[PDB]
Amino acid sequence: IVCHTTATSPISAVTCPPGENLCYRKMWCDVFCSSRGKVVELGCAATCPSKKPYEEVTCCSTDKCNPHPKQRPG
Amino acid sequence: KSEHETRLEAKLFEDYSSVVRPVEDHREIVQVTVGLQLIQLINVDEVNQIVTTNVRLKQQWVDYNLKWNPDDYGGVKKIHIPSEKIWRPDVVLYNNADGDFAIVKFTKVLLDYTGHITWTPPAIFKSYCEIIVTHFPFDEQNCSMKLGTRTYDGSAVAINPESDQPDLSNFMESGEWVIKEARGWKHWVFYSCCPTTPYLDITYHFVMQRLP
Ligand SMILES: *[C@@H]1O[C@H](CO)[C@@H](O[C@@H]2O[C@H](CO)[C@@H](O[C@@H]3O[C@H](CO[C@H]4O[C@H](CO[C@H]5O[C@H](CO)[C@@H](O)[C@H](O)[C@@H]5O[C@H]5O[C@H](CO)[C@@H](O)[C@H](O)[C@@H]5O)[C@@H](O)[C@H](O[C@H]5O[C@H](CO)[C@@H](O)[C@H](O)[C@@H]5O)[C@@H]4O)[C@@H](O)[C@H](O[C@H]4O[C@H](CO)[C@@H](O)[C@H](O)[C@@H]4O[C@H]4O[C@H](CO)[C@@H](O)[C@H](O)[C@@H]4O[C@H]4O[C@H](CO)[C@@H](O)[C@H](O)[C@@H]4O)[C@@H]3O)[C@H](O)[C@H]2NC(C)=O)[C@H](O)[C@H]1NC(C)=O
Numbered sequence A: 001i002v003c004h005t006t007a008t009s010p011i012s013a014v015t016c017p018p019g020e021n022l023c024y025r026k027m028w029c030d031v032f033c034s035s036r037g038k039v040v041e042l043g044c045a046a047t048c049p050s051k052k053p054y055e056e057v058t059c060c061s062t063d064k065c066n067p068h069p070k071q072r073p074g
Numbered sequence B: 001k002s003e004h005e006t007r008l009e010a011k012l013f014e015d016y017s018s019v020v021r022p023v024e025d026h027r028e029i030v031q032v033t034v035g036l037q038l039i040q041l042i043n044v045d046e047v048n049q050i051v052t053t054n055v056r057l058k059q060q061w062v063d064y065n066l067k068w069n070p071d072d073y074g075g076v077k078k079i080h081i082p083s084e085k086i087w088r089p090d091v092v093l094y095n096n097a098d099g100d101f102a103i104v105k106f107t108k109v110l111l112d113y114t115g116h117i118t119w120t121p122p123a124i125f126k127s128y129c130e131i132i133v134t135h136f137p138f139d140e141q142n143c144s145m146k147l148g149t150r151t152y153d154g155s156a157v158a159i160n161p162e163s164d165q166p167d168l169s170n171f172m173e174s175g176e177w178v179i180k181e182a183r184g185w186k187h188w189v190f191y192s193c194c195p196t197t198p199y200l201d202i203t204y205h206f207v208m209q210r211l212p
Helices: B002-013
Strands: A002-005 A012-015 A022-028 A039-045 A056-060 B030-045 B050-062 B078-081 B091-093 B109-112 B116-119 B122-131 B140-149 B157-161 B177-191 B199-210
Touching: A002 A022, A002 A039, B002 B078, B030 B140, B030 B177, B030 B199, B050 B140, B140 B157, B157 B177, B157 B199
Parallel strands: B030 B157
Antiparallel strands: A002 A012, A022 A039, A022 A056, A039 B177, B030 B050, B050 B116, B050 B122, B078 B109, B091 B140, B109 B116, B122 B140, B140 B199, B177 B199
């Protein structure tokens, strides 16, 4: 499975490693939310990352299904 | 001396703008060297796990429009000027426990004839600390301070750590706590507003431990 990742700048797509079969997207507000919007974290995962009261995490199993919120998935 | 310094200051600011980045061409990314200096832990709130610290944030960058020739001003090669008069990157602490931004004092900057600026404003930071619950007793906490430009993103201004470790050469130790480890890490962070341009931050952290 190919996943988008914020581990690189610019954001890139990578073949997720053995064991990591899900692509995920985490977003949350920090002090700059009102102007820059939520922080965006994208990557690979074996299992969906725990969500917090202030975290928004979504998981999926299709190629590049976790794009930056402003870009089309796939 | 003072006669020439007064002269060059008027010259430098007769047609200066602190609103635009000090680069000759807007394509250029301003390079800012950032170095956190820890001065003293002044308050420890163990119930909320918040520590208040006195610091100084050393910042260095070159201002294209603030150059001159020492020979034209009696050999003067450096001068001190109010930080409020020049463009600044607006580096801010943004994980301030109480308030949403720390207390700072805009002190004077050191400017040399090459346009190189050295600014070391003092500040009072309030940081949340994470208890290191690995070993007993759990008398160790990890406090962090995240710094980054308030408005500019990575394609306009780049902040680079002056060193991998904060400067503790002027740190006044406590009689009850010791800083066991301290380091700064630079990150490239993406926000929902902007899919292509990352925002930069340097996060410094220090692990402090209660003395027996
Ligand atoms: C107390 O609390 C503290 C606060 O919470 C806490 O601090 C945290 O500490 C940890 C360390 O313990 C920190 O983790 C490190 O973070 C580093 C920085 O991370 C950012 O940058 C990377 C890299 O980005 C560059 O590179 C990519 C490509 O790789 C580019 O696409 C980028 O554009 C960018 O490029 C520039 O920089 C490059 C240099 O790195 C240049 O080459 C290049 O030209 C450009 O100039 C990003 O990937 C990170 O993204 C991730 O995190 C963000 C948000 O944080 C997420 O949004 C995102 O999704 C990602 O998850 C981030 O932006 C990391 O570089 C560093 O990584 C190394 O270590 C880890 C684990 O040890 C490895 O997995 C990783 O592979 C790296 O390994 C190298 O280095 C280690 C040494 O540590 C070696 O052992 C290893 O062999 C390897 O060495 C090789 O590379 C070295 C250079 O990297 C080189 O020196 C060697 O010679 C060799 O070649 C690591 O993850 C963390 O950031 C702190 N967090 C905070 C908030 O501060 C602290 O731990 C707590 N303390 C305690 C005790 O509890």
